[PDB]
Design a protein around this ligand. Structure first.
Ligand SMILES: *[C@@H]1O[C@H](CO)[C@@H](O)[C@H](O)[C@H]1NC(C)=O
Ligand SMILES: *[C@@H]1O[C@H](CO)[C@@H](O)[C@H](O)[C@H]1NC(C)=O
Ligand SMILES: *[C@@H]1O[C@H](CO)[C@@H](O)[C@H](O)[C@H]1NC(C)=O
Ligand SMILES: *[C@@H]1O[C@H](CO)[C@@H](O)[C@H](O)[C@H]1NC(C)=O
Ligand SMILES: *[C@@H]1O[C@H](CO)[C@@H](O)[C@H](O)[C@H]1NC(C)=O
Ligand SMILES: [Ca+2]
Ligand SMILES: [Ca+2]
Ligand SMILES: [Ca+2]
Ligand SMILES: [Ca+2]
Ligand SMILES: [Ca+2]
Ligand SMILES: [Ca+2]
Ligand SMILES: [Ca+2]
Ligand SMILES: [Ca+2]
Ligand SMILES: [Ca+2]
Ligand SMILES: [Ca+2]
Lengths: 204, 204, 204, 204, 204
């Protein structure tokens, strides 16, 4: 229940411990989800964008940037990666969905669909997560690694417990996002830890 | 048969097992043909796009992507290769025709003609094929190779027993193909084996 | 004798044998000429575009492609080379003229003039040629070299016994050449030898 | 006391001597500032753009160009660097702001925001500066280094004791800057030392 | 006394001999000048564009192309160099001015200003030159060097005994120069030596 409309989290330096915890009362394992957000970073090294771990389970749901032009999704430790043409540095809008019944993962980058990949067909993502921005978890809520830290700005984050169709992804990118039931930027419960500053969104 | 209008086959992972068999009652050897389809892959390694083998004959008709910008056609184990400027990764529309009487093979990539090449003048492509998407055959229906597997999405596949003129290739590129008498995406007889998922086409 | 309007010669493979002889009743040594044609090849190695030899004289008039972006004209074994920015692979329209009185050679690529060069001022190109497409001659009509063979398509070839002014070069580039009196694609006397196929021009 | 509208300082050669002192009446420590200026240089090596040293303190506020596409701000010897896509050589409009309360530094290059970075949260930039263009100070007003000298043109320099919002940054980029209370190009007190020439600005 | 409107000098081959002498009747030292001309060359090696030597003084005023994108001016044996983004090969319009009082040299390439540089403040360029196109002088009228020779085309050359403001530079670039008093293409006194041919300007 904070409205972050028009605002970003700024992670202004590299560190082991600067991060934001995102709080959701998620009790039911996820069969389907979509996650969208905008990010702006001038790192060239690898970094985590969104880290969701559960007790005893590393990389339960992880969105990770390998290198320029390459986005990975981990589900239950397993991973897929898809490629895109992108400028560097540049702001980006990222959406990723995953559907247990097919295993299909869909990345959409600036409203453009990447090649579909598939993993973990039939699996359910475990509930009661710890969700972190700014660092990559290796434990339940911690064991960070500064070489995977996100330095830069993140905004307009939403997470739904369904697979959004293309029209709803384009709405998030450049229209009005559909209100979201797991995490929603207009009513976000978060905890800042360390050096993270909230500022207006000034980039597109 | 099945009308896959608006849908693609998704080969969501690298494997030696995942494939689609395409069924056609082709009993008479082929003198002329055109094959068109759309594909979207972010593989950089080589892969097979369309594998047609007959009893005792490898690479009887094979469309093979050597590397970015380079397309090969095999007829009766002989090959030609032509080059094109293309972005990577990117969706592509591919048409290729071959005419026994001249030996001429014509690739068209996104409605643009590649340099003509020639092979197997006077040859007849044998009938009673096994036709596979997703893997390259080295036997009659099998002996796949993971390093040649196709990972990504294929749709809008049509095959004619004649050489299409430019206007009919552009029609196919634009999404209004002429009726096709060997394989037709709107009345396709196929078998999924392994991990292949049918999804809507979202990238055209 | 044959009107090849709308048609190309296709040299569909690398060889030391495949060629076209162009026949013209040229009995008087040439003081001035312009030669225009369209070509489409995806070779990266060097190749001959137009080979004119006379008895006892190799490289009497030769248009040669050194590498991407570089065009050479030989007159009586001496050469000039001019450079241009071009895409690869791409169709190209090439015009070259030479004027004995000044020695000036003008290349025009896709209707744009290259830097003028000069050679053989005062020379007359010898008459009674053998003129070959598809191979580079080292004798009077023969002694070909596979490594200089042209693979690809040639069309719209015209040769005048004068130096065309710019607006006449542009007319030829646009597909409306002024009347040509040495070689004329719309009334061409030729001989196919080996594997050369006439097909419609589909890339203009 | 001088309106330099429409004019630039030209540092026409590499040297360890040529520089401009900028004189400001500011006597209180700075908690917030914005600095904007336009520069045109064809140096590839690193160079100082704006050097603000105070007695006893090197690099108290320093704007430094590491290499093409990379801009650094030093505050009290600590630094941040942000990246941008830019052509070389090219004129550039540079703005940078810093806010003590958050430590946030914002670079804007040709009206486009770079990724925010943070340093020196809670710090006060010392007053009674010597402010130098053309050279990088290693002492209070001197100790220059030829290899960090600025060669080229600088104009349209303004410095405010506040953090400008995006609209006011864009106004400056577009040529209608707000009046500026630390340094103002339209009412500037300066001292030329060595070879620095004032000329009309011809490159906007 | 010759009007070369619409014509160029073509230096069609590398040599240590081919050149044009340009003769001015204005006999006076130069405190200010501007020189404009068009050039088209596909050399990659260094070459002289305009060579002005006086008795016993080499490199008294020299415009020299170091390599792609780099232009140098020598005044009295001292030099400056400025860089520009340009295509290769490409026609170019070059203007350069120099002002003794400030030492400032201004290059303009296709109507766009390069970074100003400065040299020889207070010097007077000596009177009674030999002015050569096509070769770089090392003596008064001679001692050429084939590795510095200009191959290609030069036209629309004008030289004024003043520093042109930007609007007059743009007029020259656009083909409507102000009449010029040191050298003027519409009333030029020149001597061709060796192989230099006058042809129409076809590349503007
Ligand atoms: C996931 O979606 C599938 C099909 O769209 C549906 O069967 C299932 O109920 C969804 N799961 C949940 C928990 O909503
Ligand atoms: C194949 O094409 C050739 C050339 O157009 C034609 O003559 C022949 O009839 C065709 N063959 C069949 C089986 O249609
Ligand atoms: C070749 O061109 C020159 C120069 O224009 C001309 O004088 C000469 O007559 C021409 N030669 C011919 C037509 O044989
Ligand atoms: C510095 O800038 C901030 C802008 O958020 C402002 O709130 C604060 O009052 C300023 N401090 C001073 C000393 O002016
Ligand atoms: C040189 O040019 C400047 C303007 O650029 C002018 O003010 C000055 O009078 C000129 N000097 C002469 C003509 O000697
Ligand atoms: Ca982890
Ligand atoms: Ca980790
Ligand atoms: Ca095979
Ligand atoms: Ca195989
Ligand atoms: Ca030869
Ligand atoms: Ca040869
Ligand atoms: Ca310093
Ligand atoms: Ca220093
Ligand atoms: Ca010299
Ligand atoms: Ca010399």
């Amino acid at each position: 229940h904070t409205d972050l409309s028009g605002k970003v989290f700024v992670f202004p330096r590299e560190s082991v411990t600067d991060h934001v915890n995102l709080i959701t009362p998620l009790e039911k394992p996820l069969q389907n989800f979509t996650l969208c957000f905008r990010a702006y970073s001038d790192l060239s090294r690898a970094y985590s964008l969104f880290s969701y771990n559960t007790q005893g389970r590393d990389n339960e749901l992880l969105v990770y940037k390998e290198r320029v032009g390459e986005y990975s999704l981990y589900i239950g430790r397993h991973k897929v990666t898809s490629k895109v043409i992108e400028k560097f540095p540049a702001p980006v809008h990222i959406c990723v969905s995953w559907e247990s019944s097919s295993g299909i993962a869909e990345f959409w980058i600036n409203g453009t669909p990447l090649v579909k990949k598939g993993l973990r067909q039939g699996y359910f993502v475990e509930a009661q997560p710890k969700i972190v921005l700014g660092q990559e978890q290796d434990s339940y809520g911690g064991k960070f690694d500064r070489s995977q830290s996100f330095v830069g700005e993140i905004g307009d984050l939403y997470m739904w417990d369904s697979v959004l169709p293309p029209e709803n992804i384009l709405s998030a990118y450049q229209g009005t996002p559909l209100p979201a039931n797991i995490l929603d930027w207009q009513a976000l419960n978060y905890e800042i830890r360390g050096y993270v500053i909230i500022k207006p969104l000034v980039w597109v």
